[PDB]
Structure formats: C-alpha cells, structure tokens
N, CA and C atoms as an extended XYZ file, in Angstrom:
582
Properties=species:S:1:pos:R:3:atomname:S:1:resname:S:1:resid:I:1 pbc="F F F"
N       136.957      143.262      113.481 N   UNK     1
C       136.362      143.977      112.319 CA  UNK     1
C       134.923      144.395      112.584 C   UNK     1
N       134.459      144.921      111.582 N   UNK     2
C       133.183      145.351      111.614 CA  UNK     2
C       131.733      144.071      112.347 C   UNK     2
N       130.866      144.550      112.545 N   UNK     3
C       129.758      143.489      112.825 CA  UNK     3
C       128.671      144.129      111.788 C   UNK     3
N       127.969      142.961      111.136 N   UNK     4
C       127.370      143.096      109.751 CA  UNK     4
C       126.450      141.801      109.688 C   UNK     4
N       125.108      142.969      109.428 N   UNK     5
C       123.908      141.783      109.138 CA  UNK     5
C       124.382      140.697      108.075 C   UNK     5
N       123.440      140.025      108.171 N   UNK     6
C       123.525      138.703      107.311 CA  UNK     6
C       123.367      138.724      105.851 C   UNK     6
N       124.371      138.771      104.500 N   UNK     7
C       123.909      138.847      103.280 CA  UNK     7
C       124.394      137.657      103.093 C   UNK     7
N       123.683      137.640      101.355 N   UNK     8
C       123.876      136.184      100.453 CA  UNK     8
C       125.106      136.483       99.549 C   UNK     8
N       125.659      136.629       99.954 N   UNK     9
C       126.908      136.862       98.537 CA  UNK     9
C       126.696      135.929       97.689 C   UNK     9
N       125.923      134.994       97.079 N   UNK    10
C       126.015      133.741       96.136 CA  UNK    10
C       123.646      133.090       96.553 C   UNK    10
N       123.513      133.720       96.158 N   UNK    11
C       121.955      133.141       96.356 CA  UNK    11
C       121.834      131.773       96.038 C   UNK    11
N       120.790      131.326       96.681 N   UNK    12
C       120.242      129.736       95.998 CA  UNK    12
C       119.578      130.162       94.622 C   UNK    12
N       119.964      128.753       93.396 N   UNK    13
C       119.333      129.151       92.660 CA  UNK    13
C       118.352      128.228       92.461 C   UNK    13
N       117.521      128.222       91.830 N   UNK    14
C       116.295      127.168       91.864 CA  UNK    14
C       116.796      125.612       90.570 C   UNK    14
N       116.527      124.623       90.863 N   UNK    15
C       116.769      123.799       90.216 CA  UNK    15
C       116.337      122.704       89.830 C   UNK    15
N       116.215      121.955       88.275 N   UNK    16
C       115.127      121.106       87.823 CA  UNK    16
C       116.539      119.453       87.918 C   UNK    16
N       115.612      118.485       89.141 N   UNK    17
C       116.913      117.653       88.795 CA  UNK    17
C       116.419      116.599       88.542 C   UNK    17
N       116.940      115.132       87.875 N   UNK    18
C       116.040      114.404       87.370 CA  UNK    18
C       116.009      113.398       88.373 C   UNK    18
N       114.946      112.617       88.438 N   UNK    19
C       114.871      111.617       89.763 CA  UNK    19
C       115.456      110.486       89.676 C   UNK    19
N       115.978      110.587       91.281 N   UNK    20
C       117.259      109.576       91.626 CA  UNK    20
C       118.319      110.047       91.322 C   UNK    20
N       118.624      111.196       90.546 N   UNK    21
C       120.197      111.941       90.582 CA  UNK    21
C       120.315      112.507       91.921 C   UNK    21
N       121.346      113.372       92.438 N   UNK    22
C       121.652      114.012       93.552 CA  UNK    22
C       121.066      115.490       93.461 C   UNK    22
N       120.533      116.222       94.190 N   UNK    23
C       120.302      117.814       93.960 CA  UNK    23
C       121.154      118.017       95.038 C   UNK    23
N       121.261      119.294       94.832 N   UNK    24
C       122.316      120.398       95.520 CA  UNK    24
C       122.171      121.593       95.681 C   UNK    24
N       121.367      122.161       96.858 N   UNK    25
C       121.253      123.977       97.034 CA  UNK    25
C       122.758      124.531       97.425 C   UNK    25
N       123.175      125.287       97.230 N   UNK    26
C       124.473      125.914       97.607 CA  UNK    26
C       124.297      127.056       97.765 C   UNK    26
N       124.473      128.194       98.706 N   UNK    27
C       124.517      129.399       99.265 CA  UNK    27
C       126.149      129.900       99.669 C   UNK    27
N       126.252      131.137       99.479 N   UNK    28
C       127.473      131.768      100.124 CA  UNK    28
C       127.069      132.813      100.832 C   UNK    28
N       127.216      132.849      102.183 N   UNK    29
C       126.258      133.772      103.327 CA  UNK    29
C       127.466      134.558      104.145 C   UNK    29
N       127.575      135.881      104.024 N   UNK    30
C       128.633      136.889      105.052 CA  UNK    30
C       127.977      137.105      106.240 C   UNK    30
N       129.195      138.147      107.004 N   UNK    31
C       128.011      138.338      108.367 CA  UNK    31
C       129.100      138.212      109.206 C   UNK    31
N       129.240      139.186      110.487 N   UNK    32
C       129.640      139.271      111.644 CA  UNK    32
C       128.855      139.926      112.602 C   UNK    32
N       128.864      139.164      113.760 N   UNK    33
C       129.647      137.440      114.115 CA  UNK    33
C       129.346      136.258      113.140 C   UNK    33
N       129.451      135.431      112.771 N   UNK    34
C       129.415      134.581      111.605 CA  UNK    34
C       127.494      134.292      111.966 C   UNK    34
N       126.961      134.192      110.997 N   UNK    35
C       125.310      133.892      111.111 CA  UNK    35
C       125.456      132.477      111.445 C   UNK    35
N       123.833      131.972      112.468 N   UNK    36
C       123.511      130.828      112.635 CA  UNK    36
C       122.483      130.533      111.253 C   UNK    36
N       122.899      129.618      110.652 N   UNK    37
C       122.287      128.913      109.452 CA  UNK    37
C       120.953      128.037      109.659 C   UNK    37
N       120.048      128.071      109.287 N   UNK    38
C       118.740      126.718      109.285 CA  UNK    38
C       118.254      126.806      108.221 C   UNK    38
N       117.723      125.238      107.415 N   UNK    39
C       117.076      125.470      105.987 CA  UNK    39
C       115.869      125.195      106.450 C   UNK    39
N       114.979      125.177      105.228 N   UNK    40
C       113.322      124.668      105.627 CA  UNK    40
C       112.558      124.510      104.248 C   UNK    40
N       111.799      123.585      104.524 N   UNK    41
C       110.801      123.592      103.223 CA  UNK    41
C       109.433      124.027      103.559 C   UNK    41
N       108.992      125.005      102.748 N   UNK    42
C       107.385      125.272      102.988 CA  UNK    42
C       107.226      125.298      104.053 C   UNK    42
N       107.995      126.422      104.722 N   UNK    43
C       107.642      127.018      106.207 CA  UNK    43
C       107.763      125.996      107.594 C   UNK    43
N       109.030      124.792      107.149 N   UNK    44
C       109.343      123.714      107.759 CA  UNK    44
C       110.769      123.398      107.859 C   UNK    44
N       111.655      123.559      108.823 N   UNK    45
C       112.785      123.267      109.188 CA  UNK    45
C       113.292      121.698      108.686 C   UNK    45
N       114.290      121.764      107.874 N   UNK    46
C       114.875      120.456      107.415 CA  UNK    46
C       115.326      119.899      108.358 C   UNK    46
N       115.643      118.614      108.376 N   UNK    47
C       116.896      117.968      109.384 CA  UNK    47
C       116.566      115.882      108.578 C   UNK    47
N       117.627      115.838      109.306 N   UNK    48
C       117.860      114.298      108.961 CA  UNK    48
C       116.803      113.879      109.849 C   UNK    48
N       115.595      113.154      109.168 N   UNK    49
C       114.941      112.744      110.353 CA  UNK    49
C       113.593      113.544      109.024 C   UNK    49
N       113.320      114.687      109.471 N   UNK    50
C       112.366      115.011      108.280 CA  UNK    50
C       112.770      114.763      106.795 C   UNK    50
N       113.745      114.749      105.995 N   UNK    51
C       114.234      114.014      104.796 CA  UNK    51
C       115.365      113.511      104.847 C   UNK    51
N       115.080      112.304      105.279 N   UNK    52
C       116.221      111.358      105.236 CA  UNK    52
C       117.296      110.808      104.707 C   UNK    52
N       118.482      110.933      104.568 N   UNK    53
C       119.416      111.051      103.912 CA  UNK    53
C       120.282      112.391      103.852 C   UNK    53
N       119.607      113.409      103.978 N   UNK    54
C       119.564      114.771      103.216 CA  UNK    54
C       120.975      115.205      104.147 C   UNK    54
N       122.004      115.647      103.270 N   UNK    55
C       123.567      116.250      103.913 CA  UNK    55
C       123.114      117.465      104.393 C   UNK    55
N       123.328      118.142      105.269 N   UNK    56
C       123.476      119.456      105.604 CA  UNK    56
C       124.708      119.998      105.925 C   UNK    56
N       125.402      121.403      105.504 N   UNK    57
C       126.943      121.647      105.831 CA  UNK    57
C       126.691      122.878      105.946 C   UNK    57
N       127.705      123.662      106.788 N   UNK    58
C       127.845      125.015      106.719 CA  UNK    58
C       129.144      125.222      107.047 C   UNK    58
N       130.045      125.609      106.018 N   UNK    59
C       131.456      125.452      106.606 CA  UNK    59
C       132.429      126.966      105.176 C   UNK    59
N       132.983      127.494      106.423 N   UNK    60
C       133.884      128.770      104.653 CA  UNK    60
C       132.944      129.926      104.787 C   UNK    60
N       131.238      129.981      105.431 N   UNK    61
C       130.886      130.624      104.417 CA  UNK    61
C       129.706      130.072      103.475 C   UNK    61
N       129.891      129.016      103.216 N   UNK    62
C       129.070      128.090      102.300 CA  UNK    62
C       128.556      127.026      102.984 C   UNK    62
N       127.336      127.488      103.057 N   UNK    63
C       126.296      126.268      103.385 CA  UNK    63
C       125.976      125.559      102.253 C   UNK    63
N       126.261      124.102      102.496 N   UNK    64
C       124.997      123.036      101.445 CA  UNK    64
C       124.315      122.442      102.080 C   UNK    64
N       123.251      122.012      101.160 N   UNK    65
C       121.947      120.904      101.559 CA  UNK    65
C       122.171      120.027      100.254 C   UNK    65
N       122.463      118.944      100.733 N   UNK    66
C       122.248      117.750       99.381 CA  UNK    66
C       121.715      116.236       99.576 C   UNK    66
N       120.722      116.507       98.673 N   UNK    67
C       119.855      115.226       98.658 CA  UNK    67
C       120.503      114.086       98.104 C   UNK    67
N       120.857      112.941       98.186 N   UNK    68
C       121.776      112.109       97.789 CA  UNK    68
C       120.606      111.427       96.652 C   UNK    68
N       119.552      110.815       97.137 N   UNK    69
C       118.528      110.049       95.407 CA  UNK    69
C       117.309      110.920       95.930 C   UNK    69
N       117.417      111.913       95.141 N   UNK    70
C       116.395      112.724       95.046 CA  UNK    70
C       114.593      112.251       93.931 C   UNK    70
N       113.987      112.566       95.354 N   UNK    71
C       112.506      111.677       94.630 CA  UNK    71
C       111.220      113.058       94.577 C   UNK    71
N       110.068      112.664       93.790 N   UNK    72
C       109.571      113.503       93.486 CA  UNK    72
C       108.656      113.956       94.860 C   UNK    72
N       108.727      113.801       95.824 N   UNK    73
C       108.264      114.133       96.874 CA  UNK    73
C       108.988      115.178       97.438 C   UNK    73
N       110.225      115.369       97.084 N   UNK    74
C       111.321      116.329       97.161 CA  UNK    74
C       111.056      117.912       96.622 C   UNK    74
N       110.668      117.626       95.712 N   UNK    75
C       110.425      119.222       95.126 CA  UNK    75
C       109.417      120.151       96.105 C   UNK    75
N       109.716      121.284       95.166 N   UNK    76
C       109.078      122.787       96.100 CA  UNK    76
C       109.806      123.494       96.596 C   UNK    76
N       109.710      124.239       97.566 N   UNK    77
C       110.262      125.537       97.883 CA  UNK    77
C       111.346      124.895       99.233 C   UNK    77
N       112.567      125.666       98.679 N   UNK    78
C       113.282      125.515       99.529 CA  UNK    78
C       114.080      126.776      100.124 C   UNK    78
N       114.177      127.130      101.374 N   UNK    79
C       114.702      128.356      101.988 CA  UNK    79
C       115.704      128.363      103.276 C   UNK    79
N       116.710      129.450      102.907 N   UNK    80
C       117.972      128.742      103.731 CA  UNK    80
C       118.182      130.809      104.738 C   UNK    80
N       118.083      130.336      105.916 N   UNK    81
C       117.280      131.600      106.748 CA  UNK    81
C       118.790      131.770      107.588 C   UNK    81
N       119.615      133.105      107.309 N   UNK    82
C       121.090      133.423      108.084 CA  UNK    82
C       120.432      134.230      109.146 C   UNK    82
N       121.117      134.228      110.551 N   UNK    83
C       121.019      134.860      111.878 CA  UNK    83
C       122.409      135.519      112.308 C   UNK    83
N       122.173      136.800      112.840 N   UNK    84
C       122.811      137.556      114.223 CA  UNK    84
C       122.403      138.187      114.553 C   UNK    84
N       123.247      139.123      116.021 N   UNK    85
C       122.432      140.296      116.189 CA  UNK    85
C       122.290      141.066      115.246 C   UNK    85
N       122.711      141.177      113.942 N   UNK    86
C       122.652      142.767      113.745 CA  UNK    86
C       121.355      142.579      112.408 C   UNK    86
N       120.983      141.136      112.428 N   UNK    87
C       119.748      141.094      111.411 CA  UNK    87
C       119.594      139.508      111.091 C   UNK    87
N       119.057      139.532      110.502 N   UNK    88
C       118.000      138.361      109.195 CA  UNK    88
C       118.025      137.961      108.003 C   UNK    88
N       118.467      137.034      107.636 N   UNK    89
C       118.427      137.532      105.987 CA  UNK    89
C       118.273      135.951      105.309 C   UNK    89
N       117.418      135.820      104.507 N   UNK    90
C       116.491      134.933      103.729 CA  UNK    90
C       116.655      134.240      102.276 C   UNK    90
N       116.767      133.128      101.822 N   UNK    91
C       117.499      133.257       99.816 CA  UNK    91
C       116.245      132.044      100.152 C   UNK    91
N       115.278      132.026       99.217 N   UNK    92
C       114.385      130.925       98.310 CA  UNK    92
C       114.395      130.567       97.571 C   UNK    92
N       114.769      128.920       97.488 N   UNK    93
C       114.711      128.705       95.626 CA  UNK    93
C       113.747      127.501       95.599 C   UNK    93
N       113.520      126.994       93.984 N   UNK    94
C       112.492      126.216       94.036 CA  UNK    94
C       113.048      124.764       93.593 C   UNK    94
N       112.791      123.797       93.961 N   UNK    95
C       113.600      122.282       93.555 CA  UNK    95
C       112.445      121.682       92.601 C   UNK    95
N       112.543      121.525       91.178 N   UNK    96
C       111.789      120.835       89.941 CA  UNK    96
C       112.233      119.201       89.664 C   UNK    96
N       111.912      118.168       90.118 N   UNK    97
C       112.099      117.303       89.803 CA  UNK    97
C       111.124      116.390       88.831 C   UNK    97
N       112.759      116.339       87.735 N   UNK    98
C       111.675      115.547       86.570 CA  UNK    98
C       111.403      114.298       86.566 C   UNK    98
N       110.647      113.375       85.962 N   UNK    99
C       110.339      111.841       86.119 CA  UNK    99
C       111.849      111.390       85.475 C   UNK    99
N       111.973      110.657       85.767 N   UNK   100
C       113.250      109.005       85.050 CA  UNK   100
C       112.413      108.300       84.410 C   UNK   100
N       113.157      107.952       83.357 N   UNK   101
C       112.507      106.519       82.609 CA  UNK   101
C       113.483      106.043       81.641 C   UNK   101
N       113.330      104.989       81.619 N   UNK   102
C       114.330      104.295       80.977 CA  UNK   102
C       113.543      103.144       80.155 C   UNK   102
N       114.201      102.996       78.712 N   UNK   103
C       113.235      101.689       78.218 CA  UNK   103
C       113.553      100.533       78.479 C   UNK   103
N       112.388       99.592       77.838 N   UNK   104
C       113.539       97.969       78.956 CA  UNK   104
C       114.369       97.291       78.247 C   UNK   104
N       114.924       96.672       79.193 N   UNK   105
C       116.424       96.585       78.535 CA  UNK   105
C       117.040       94.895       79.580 C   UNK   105
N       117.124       93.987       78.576 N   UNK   106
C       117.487       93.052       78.831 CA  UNK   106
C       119.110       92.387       79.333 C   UNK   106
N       119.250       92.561       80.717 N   UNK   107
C       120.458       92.797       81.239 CA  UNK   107
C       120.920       91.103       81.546 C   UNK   107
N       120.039       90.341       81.188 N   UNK   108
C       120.033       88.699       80.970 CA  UNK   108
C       119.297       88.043       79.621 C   UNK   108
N       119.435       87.642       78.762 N   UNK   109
C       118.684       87.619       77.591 CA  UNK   109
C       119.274       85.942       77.901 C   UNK   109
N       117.665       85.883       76.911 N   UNK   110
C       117.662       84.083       76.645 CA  UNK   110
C       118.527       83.440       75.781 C   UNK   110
N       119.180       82.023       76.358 N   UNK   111
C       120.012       81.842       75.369 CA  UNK   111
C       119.732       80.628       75.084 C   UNK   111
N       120.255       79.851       73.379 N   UNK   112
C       119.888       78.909       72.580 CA  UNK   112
C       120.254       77.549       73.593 C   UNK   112
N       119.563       76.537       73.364 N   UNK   113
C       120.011       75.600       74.114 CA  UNK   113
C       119.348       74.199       73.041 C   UNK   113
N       120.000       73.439       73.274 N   UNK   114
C       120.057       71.953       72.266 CA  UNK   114
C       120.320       70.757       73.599 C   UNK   114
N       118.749       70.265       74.571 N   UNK   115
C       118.876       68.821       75.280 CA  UNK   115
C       118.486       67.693       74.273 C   UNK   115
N       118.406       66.616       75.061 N   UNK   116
C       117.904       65.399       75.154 CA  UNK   116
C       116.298       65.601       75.622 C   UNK   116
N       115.875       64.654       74.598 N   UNK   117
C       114.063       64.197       75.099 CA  UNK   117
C       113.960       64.158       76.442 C   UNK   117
N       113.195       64.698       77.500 N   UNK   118
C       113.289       64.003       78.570 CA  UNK   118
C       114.081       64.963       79.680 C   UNK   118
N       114.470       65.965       79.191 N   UNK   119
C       115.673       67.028       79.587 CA  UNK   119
C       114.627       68.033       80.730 C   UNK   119
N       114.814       68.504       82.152 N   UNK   120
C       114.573       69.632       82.014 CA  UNK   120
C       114.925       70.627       81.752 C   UNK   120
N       114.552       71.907       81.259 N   UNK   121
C       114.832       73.128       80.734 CA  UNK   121
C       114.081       74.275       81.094 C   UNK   121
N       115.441       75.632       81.651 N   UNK   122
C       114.854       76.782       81.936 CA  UNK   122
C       115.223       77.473       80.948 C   UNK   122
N       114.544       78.261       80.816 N   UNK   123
C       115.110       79.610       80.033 CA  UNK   123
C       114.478       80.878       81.120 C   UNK   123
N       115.635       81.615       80.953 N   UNK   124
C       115.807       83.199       81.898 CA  UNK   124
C       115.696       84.102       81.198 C   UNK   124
N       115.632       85.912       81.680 N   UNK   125
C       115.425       86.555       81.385 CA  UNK   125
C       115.737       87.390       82.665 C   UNK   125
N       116.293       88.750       82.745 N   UNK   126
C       116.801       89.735       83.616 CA  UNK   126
C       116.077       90.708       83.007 C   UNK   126
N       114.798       91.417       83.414 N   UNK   127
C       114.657       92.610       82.984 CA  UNK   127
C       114.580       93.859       83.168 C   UNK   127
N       115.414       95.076       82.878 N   UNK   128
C       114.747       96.400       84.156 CA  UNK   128
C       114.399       97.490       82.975 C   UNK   128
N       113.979       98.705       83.707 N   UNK   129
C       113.215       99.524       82.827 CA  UNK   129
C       112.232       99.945       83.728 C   UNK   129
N       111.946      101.931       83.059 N   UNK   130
C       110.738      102.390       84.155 CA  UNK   130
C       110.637      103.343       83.373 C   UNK   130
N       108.934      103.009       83.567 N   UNK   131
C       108.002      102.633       84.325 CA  UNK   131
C       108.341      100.885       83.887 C   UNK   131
N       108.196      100.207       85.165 N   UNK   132
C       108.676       98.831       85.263 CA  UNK   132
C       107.533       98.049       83.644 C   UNK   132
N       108.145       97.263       82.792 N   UNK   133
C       108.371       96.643       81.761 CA  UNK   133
C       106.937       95.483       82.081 C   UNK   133
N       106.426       95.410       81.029 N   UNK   134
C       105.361       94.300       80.847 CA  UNK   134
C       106.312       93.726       80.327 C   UNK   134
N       106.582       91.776       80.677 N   UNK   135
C       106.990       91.091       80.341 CA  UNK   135
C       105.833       89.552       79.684 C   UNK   135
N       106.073       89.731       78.424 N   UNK   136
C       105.567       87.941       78.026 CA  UNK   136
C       106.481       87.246       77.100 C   UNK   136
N       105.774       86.118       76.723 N   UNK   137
C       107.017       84.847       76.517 CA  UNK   137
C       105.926       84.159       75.165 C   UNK   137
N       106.693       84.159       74.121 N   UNK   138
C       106.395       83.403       73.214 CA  UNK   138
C       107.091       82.223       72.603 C   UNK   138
N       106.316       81.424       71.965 N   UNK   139
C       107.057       80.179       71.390 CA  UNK   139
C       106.583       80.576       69.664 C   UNK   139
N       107.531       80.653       68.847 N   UNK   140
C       106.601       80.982       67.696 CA  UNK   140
C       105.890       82.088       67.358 C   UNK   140
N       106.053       83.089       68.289 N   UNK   141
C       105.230       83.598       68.231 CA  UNK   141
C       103.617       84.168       68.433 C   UNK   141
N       103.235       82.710       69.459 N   UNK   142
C       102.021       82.601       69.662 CA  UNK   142
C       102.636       82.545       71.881 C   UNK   142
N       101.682       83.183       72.334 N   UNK   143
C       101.937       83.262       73.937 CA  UNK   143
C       101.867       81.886       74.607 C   UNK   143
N       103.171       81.868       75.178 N   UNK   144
C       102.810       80.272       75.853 CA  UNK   144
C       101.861       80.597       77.152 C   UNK   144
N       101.591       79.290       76.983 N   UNK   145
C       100.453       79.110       78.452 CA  UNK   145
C       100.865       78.153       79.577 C   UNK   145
N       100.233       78.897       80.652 N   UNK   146
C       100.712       77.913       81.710 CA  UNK   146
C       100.307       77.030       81.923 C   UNK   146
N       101.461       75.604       82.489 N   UNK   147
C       100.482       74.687       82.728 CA  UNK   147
C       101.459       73.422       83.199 C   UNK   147
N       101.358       72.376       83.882 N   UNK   148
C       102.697       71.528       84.630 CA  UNK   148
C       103.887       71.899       83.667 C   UNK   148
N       103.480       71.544       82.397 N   UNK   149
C       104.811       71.231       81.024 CA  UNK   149
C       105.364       72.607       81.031 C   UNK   149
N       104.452       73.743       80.935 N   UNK   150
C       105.596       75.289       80.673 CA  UNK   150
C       104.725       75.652       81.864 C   UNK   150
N       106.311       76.408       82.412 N   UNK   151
C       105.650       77.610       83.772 CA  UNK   151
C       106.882       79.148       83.938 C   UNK   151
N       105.582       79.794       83.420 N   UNK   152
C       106.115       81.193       84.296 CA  UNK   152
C       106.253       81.697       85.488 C   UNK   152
N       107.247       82.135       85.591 N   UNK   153
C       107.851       82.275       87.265 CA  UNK   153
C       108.763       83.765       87.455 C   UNK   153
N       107.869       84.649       87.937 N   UNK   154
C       108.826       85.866       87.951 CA  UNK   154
C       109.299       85.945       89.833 C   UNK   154
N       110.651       87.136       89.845 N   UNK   155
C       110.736       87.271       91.244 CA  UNK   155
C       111.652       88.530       91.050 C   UNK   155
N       111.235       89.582       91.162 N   UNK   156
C       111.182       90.895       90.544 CA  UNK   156
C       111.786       90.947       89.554 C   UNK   156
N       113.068       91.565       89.052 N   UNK   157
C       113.584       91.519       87.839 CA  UNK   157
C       113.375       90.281       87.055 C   UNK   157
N       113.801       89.123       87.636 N   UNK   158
C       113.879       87.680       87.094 CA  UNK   158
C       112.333       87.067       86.629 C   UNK   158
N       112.410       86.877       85.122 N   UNK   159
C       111.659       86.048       84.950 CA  UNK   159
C       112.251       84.634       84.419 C   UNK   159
N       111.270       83.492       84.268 N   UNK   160
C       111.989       82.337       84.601 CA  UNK   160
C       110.871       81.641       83.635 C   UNK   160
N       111.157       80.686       82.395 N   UNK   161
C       110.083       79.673       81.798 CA  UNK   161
C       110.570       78.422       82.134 C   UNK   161
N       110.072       77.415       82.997 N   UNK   162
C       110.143       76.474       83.237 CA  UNK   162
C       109.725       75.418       82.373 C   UNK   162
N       110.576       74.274       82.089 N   UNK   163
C       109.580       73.160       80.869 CA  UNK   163
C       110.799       71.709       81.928 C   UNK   163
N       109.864       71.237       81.841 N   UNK   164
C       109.876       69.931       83.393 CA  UNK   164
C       110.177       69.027       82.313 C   UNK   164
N       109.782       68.933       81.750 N   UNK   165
C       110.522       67.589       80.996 CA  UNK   165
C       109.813       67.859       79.164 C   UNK   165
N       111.038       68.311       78.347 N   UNK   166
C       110.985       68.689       77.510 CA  UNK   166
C       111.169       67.337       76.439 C   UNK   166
N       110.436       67.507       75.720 N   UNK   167
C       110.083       66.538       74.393 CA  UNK   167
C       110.029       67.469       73.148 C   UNK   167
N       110.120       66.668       71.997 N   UNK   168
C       110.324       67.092       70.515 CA  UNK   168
C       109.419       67.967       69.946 C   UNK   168
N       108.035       68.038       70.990 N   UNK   169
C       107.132       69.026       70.152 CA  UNK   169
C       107.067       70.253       70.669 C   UNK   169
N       108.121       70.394       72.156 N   UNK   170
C       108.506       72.028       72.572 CA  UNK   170
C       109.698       72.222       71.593 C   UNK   170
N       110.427       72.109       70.651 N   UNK   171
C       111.375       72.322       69.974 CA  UNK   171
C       110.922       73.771       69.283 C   UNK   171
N       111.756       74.797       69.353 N   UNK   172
C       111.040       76.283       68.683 CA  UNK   172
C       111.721       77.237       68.946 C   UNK   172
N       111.328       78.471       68.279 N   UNK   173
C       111.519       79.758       68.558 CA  UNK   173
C       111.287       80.394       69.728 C   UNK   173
N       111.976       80.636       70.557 N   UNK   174
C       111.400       80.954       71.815 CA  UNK   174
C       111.557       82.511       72.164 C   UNK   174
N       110.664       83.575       72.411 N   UNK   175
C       111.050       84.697       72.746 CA  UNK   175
C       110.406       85.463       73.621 C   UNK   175
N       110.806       86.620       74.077 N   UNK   176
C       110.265       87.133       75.156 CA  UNK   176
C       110.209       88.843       74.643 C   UNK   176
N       108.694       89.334       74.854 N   UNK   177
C       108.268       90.956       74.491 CA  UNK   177
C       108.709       91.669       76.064 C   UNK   177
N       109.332       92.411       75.774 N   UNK   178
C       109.278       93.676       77.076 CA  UNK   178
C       109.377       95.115       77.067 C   UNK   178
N       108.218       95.478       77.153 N   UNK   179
C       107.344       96.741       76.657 CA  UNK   179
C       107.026       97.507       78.075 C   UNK   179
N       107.225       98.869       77.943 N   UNK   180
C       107.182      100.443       78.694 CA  UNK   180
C       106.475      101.102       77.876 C   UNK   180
N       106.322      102.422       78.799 N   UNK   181
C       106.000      103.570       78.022 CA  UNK   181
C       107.047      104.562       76.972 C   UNK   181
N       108.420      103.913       77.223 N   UNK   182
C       109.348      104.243       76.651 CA  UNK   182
C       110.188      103.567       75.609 C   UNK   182
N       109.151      102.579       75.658 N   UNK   183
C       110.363      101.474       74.545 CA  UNK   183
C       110.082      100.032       74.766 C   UNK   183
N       110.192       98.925       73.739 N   UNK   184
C       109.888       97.911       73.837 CA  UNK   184
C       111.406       97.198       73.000 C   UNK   184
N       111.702       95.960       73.789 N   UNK   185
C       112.892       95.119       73.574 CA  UNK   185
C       112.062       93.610       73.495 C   UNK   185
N       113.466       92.753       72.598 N   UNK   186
C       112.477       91.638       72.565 CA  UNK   186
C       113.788       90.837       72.739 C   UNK   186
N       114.135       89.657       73.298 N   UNK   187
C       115.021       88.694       73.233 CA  UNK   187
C       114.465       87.313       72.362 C   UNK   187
N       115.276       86.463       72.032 N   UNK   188
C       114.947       85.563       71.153 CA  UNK   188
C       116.046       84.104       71.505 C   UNK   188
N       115.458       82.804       71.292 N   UNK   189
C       116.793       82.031       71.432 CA  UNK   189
C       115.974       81.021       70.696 C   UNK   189
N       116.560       80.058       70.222 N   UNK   190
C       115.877       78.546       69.704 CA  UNK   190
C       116.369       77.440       70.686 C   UNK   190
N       115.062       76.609       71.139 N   UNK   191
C       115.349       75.869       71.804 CA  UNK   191
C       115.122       74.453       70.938 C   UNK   191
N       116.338       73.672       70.857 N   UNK   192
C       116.239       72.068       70.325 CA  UNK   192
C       116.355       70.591       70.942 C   UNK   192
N       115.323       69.529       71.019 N   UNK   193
C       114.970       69.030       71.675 CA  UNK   193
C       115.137       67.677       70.776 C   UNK   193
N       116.339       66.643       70.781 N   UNK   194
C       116.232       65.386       70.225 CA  UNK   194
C       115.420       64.820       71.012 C   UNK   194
C-alpha cells in the first residue's frame, strides 16, 4: 500500500488524575512503514529507569504510557513523537495531578475492658488518614501523661497506651482524638478496674 507520514488518528488528551490512582495517555498513530514511537516529558525521553514503574506499549496502532500510583511529581507536559521516512509527527498533552486526602479513620478502635487490680493493660488504636492524623489519648477527657504507670507508644499507624499495672484510680473513660485537615474521628472505650 501506500507509504504515509505519521498522523494521530486519536490525539493525547490532557488529564487531571488524583494521586495514587493510575493515569493513562493513550494515542492512536497511522503511518507507513509503521512509525517508530518515543514519549518524553519536558523535552526528556521517558523510560523505566527515568519514572519508575511507568508501562510503555505500542501495539494495533495504539501506543500507551501508564503510570501505575501516580504522584505529584508526575505532572506536566507530556509528548508522544511518531517516526518514518516520509515525516514526523508530534500530540502534547498535559498530566494535572490533584492532592488525596482522606479523613482519619479508625481501622482499630479501642475496646472496653473490665481487669483485676494489679492487671496489666493495653489499649490500641489503628489509625490512617492524609495528611497523616494528629493522634492524642484522653482519660475523662483531660490528656493523659506520660509516665512508668501510662505510656504512649506509637509505630506508624499503631498507637499503643500502656498501663503496667492498673489499679482502681485508672478506672475511666478512655478516648482517643484523631484530627487532619480533613476531618477529625474520636474512639472511646471504658476501662474497669476491681
């Protein structure tokens, strides 16, 4: 058949994706002899190795580029450049990535517990949320403090109130604030101490 510069039958279109979802440029490129394909960002050739993870395909006709957890370092100009002899041919689009956030959200919440004088006792807490969650711990309502008898103990998600040997006057309301820029959650349990 004929031999024919390089067109876009299907252009890139530019796209706003939210972070940590997948983005996806997709092109449909003609052309005989079939064009050699390369993408690039900002006047920079992609490849595994410069964004890591990143799929590249060219197969039908249809080239993709797909970012599998797309981060905000990702965005900007993206351009997918077709080759043969008989020409050149160019599609630019722009990648908008919006922030994530999520409010916090207690995926372990504290639960009621009834020892013996003399008992030790943890109480837990699982928390996630972003921008990552200020976490504190009340008894009553008033902030416990650290100290041998109560101890706070986080290890990323996990926070942890330690009480080493619990007696009748830790007996209480026990709860925990966890506050974002998006939202604040509170867990609650009563702890009882013969």
């Amino acid at each position: 058949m004929t031999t024919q510069a390089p067109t876009f039958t299907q252009p890139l279109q530019s796209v706003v994706v939210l972070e940590g979802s997948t983005a996806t440029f997709e092109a449909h490129i003609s052309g005989f002899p079939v064009p050699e394909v390369s993408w690039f960002r900002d006047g920079q050739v992609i490849s595994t190795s410069t964004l890591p993870g990143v799929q590249i395909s060219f197969s039908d006709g249809r080239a993709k580029l797909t970012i599998p957890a797309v981060t905000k370092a990702n965005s900007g100009r993206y351009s997918l450049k077709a080759t043969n002899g008989s020409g050149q041919a160019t599609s630019t689009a722009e990648l908008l990535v919006k922030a994530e956030t999520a409010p916090p959200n207690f995926v372990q919440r504290l639960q009621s517990m009834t020892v013996r004088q003399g008992s030790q006792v943890r109480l837990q807490v699982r928390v996630t949320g972003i921008p990552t969650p200020v976490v504190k711990f009340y008894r009553d309502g008033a902030e416990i403090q650290s100290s041998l008898d109560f101890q706070i103990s986080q290890e990323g998600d996990l926070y942890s109130l330690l009480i080493a040997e619990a007696y009748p006057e830790d007996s209480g309301t026990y709860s925990v604030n966890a506050t974002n820029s998006v939202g604040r959650a509170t867990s609650t349990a009563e702890l009882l101490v013969q």
